[PDB]
Every structure is written in C-alpha cells, then in structure tokens.
Amino acid sequence: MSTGDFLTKGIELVQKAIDLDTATQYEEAYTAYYNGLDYLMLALKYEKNPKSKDLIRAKFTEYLNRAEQLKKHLESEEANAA
C-alpha cells in the first residue's frame, strides 16, 4: 500500500466515473467519483512531498466539485419533474 498504488487505483476509478458521467449514468458516476476520491485521499495521506500533496489535493477538489455538480443536477432534475 503506497501512494503510487493508491493513485493508480484512484485514477482508474475516476476514469470509470468520468465514463459513466459522459454516458449520462449520473447516479452511478456520483458513486464512482467518491470511490475515486477515497483512493486520492489515501494517496494524499501517504505522500510526504508538499508539492505533490497539493497536486493531488487540487485534483481531488476537481473531482469532488464534479461529483457534487452531478448530485445537485440529479436532485434538481427530480424536483423539477416531481
């Protein structure tokens, strides 16, 4: 269990999320993004270079923001149609 391994798995998972996102499978994408965020968070915890930590944090935040945008979109769409 190393930061590189965690990054590899995180990026795979976020790539999956992004594929589901593009496919408009937003509920599944939301879950997949957060799966990805778990591993980016683990990578962050085991990384000691402060520049690399901030790089990972910046990407974490980008994926977090997208996930929350999907969530808001899902909820608002449902509320509009209720």
């Binding site: 269990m1 190393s2 930061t3 590189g4 990054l7 590899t8 990026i11 976020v14 790539q15 992004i18 996102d21 593009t22 085991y46 990384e47 000691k48 270079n49 520049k51 690399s52 790089l55 990972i56 990407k59 980008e62 994926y63 997208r66």
Partner: peptide, 21 residues
C-alpha cells in the same frame, strides 16, 4: 509506506483525467 514523490515525476507516471465540461 510513505513516499516523497517529486511532482514532475508524479505527473509523468500519473496523468489525471479531466471531468466532462
């Protein structure tokens, strides 16, 4: 367990994908 990865090295081995826009 812990690593001290240079950022330029991280970015060559790990290319972060961009979210849909």
């Amino acid at each position: 367990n812990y690593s001290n990865t240079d950022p330029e090295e991280l970015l060559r081995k790990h290319v972060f994908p961009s979210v849909p826009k």
